[PDB]
């Protein structure tokens, strides 16, 4: 009987592929060939942040574009001031091997987790003035890879259990569970409207899920290796994914197929982080070659290179306003380029 | 803007306090030695953890040897896809890889060999030393002494293998048990010595689940590792 299901899945995949090919009347590269190239931009590090002991693994810019949060595997979550570089808070994490961090839009709460399979929340604006654990989400059966805040009460988290979870911080329970991924989920990305989110699960494929409906609304299978980075396009209709194959791939939610690919022959190492600028014209992807490549979102060419880090790049974040971009690496130093 | 300058001074004082905290902590961390305990499911790693300690995805065991703090981390309750999270333990002092030598037939020894090879060849682990604990030597001895579990039936090369000259057999141990032990050791030695030099080293130690001296061994190994990392400083 399993042969019937196998044949049904095969013919459904063939039909979906034929449909995607039928909608491929043109290609983004041939239409963008008329766009003026960005050329070259010599971005330099304007601020250097020092104080982290172990390799930094996660980072997330705040909506205020002033304070930033960085997590190191020494059990430390540091809040830095972008303008003055002064550390605001230094939360000691109960779990040393932290792998994710999220700065709430309002800045009242910050989430972080890791191999402990527990997502701890910390309130930065307690009446006492100190930072204390607010909630503990210990329902996951795997390491927390990435997390992002939808609001002051709802939070999406990705765990090594191959399933994402939307939690209500107030009750501390799984409000919704997203299942379907084959491998371990690595990164998360919240759309501008906070209604849909995408993520890769080490299966060379990404899945767009709806926060309210709680189901895999769409799926993409453009990549060829494990996906480690993902970020929504500023418009919310597309997103770029980075994989260990040393190539970034753009996918549109409406096209249901890959739009373009950014890669180069000399670039053979894996990818760790990817993000878009305010306008989305520049795609900044962090590579294991100790530098970050800024590609043109339309010309598919290397518009810039940030080779200021001496160790692997772990996280990369662009402010909502797009003034500067913070690139963290395993060297325990955060560099803000502008 | 006097208020702005006052806020800046307050933030500078807070940053100085945080720098002191990160300093009194740079001090506690570099003095502590982190270790990653790994091994097959059928291995006696649980017994070793129990002896050393006498829902969470990671368990921590803190123990002091010669006034030196060692934090051993077990990655239990985690999926068997280790290719991703293992990279998180690149800076650990050592990886205590416990393999059951008596678990050879499926053939779990082959799976342990493949896992050790993958760990030794992993890009981000090329600078991390691996302490190989060939655990459950009593079971291997009992099986090879009085038993029909012929090793050549699962390792044809064993038919041509002979005890080396540098072998230090235990007083009273049967020559066949020593031969099997040193063969299982060379099985990992061939893998560890072909893709490593001046980056990471393997420390094979014949141990048992109930042996306490294992702790000491780790300590010893740690010293070696550290010393060797110190020798690297003398290279301009």
């Amino acid at each position: 009987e399993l042969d019937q299901l196998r044949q049904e899945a095969e013919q459904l995949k063939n039909q979906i592929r034929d449909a995607r090919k039928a909608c491929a009347d043109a290609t983004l590269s041939q239409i963008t060939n008329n766009i003026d190239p960005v050329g070259r931009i010599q971005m330099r590090t304007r601020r250097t942040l020092r104080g982290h002991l172990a390799k930094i693994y996660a980072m997330h810019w705040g909506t205020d574009s002033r304070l930033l949060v960085s997590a190191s595997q020494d059990g430390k979550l540091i809040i830095w001031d972008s303008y003055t570089t002064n550390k605001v808070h230094a939360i000691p994490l109960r779990s040393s091997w932290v792998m994710t961090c999220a700065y709430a839009p309002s800045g009242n709460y910050v989430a972080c987790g890791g191999l402990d399979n527990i997502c701890s929340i910390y309130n930065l604006k307690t009446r006492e003035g100190n930072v204390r654990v607010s909630r503990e989400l210990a329902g996951h059966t795997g390491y927390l890879s990435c997390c992002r805040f939808l609001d002051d009460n709802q939070i999406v988290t990705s765990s090594g259990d191959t399933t994402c979870a939307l939690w209500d911080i107030e009750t501390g329970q799984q409000t919704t569970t997203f299942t379907g991924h084959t491998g371990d989920v690595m990164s998360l990305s919240l759309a501008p409207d906070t209604r849909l989110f995408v993520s890769g699960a080490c299966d060379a494929s990404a899945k767009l899920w709806d926060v309210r409906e709680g189901m895999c609304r769409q799926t993409f299978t453009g990549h060829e290796s494990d996906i480690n980075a993902i970020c929504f396009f500023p418009n919310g209709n597309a997103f770029a994914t980075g994989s260990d194959d040393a190539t970034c791939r753009l996918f549109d939610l409406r096209a249901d197929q890959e739009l373009m690919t950014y890669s180069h022959d000399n670039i053979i190492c894996g990818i760790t982080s990817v993000s878009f600028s305010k306008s989305g014209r520049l795609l900044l992807a962090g590579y294991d070659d100790f530098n970050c490549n800024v590609w043109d979102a339309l010309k598919a060419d290397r518009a810039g290179v940030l080779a200021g880090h001496d160790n692997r790049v772990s996280c990369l974040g662009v402010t909502d306003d797009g003034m500067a971009v913070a690139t963290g690496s395993w060297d325990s130093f955060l560099k803000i380029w502008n | 803007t006097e208020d702005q300058r006052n806020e800046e001074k307050a933030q500078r004082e807070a940053n100085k306090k945080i720098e002191k905290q990160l300093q009194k902590d740079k001090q506690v961390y570099r003095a502590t030695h982190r270790l990653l305990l790994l091994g097959a499911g059928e291995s006696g790693k649980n017994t070793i953890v129990k002896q050393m300690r006498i829902t969470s995805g990671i368990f921590e065991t803190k123990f002091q040897v010669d006034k030196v703090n060692f934090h051993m981390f077990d990655v239990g309750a985690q999926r068997d896809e280790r290719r991703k999270w293992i990279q998180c333990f690149n800076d650990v002092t050592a990886i205590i890889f416990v393999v059951a030598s008596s678990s050879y037939n499926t053939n779990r020894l082959q799976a342990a060999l493949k896992l050790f090879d993958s760990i030794w060849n992993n890009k981000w682990l090329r600078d991390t030393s691996v302490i190989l604990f060939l655990n459950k030597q009593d079971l291997l001895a009992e099986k090879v002494l009085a038993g029909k579990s012929k090793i050549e039936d699962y390792f044809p090369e064993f038919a041509r293998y002979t005890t080396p000259e540098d072998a230090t057999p235990e007083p009273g141990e049967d020559p066949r048990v020593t031969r099997a032990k040193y063969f299982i050791r060379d099985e990992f030695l061939r893998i560890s010595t072909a893709s490593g030099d001046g980056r990471h080293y393997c420390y094979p130690h014949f141990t048992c689940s109930v042996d306490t001296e294992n702790i000491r061994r780790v300590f010893n190994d740690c010293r070696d590792i550290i010393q060797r990392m110190h020798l690297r400083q003398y290279e301009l």
């Epitope: 494990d226 | 068997d80 896809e81």
Partner: nanobody
């Protein structure tokens, strides 16, 4: 999407010979190391053999050395496993596994859980 289609397996008597063939698609077959593993009835995944990218480095398990031959052809993205002499204990479902990442030699495809880069496998049975 990554796709691996195994075929060539079937019934055989003791001492027979088979030639399993795995057709790959959805990636650069030459940039990844290939492996053959097997799962016996009522048993876990067992690694059989491995062949590197260029096809120079080859390895087999102790119970397979000098009995099976692994090979690859990057000109068509295909893998081959010639079984010269089989035995009853060889009955199993054979799977073809690919290296997790390219330009690497550390494999973690022996995972018991569902591996995202393995084919459906081919059932081979040997009986007198």
């Amino acid at each position: 999407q990554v796709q691996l289609q195994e075929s060539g397996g079937g019934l055989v008597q003791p001492g027979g010979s088979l030639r399993l063939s795995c057709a790959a698609s959805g990636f650069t077959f030459s940039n990844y190391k290939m492996n053959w593993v097997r799962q016996a009835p009522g048993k876990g995944l067992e690694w059989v053999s491995d062949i590197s990218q260029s096809g120079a480095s080859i390895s087999y398990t102790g119970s397979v050395k000098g009995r099976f031959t692994i090979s690859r052809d990057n000109a068509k993205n295909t893998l081959y496993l010639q079984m010269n002499s089989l035995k009853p204990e060889d009955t199993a479902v054979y799977y073809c596994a690919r290296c997790p990442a390219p330009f690497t030699r550390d494999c973690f495809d022996v995972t018991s859980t569902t591996y995202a880069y393995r084919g459906q496998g081919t059932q081979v049975t040997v009986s007198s």
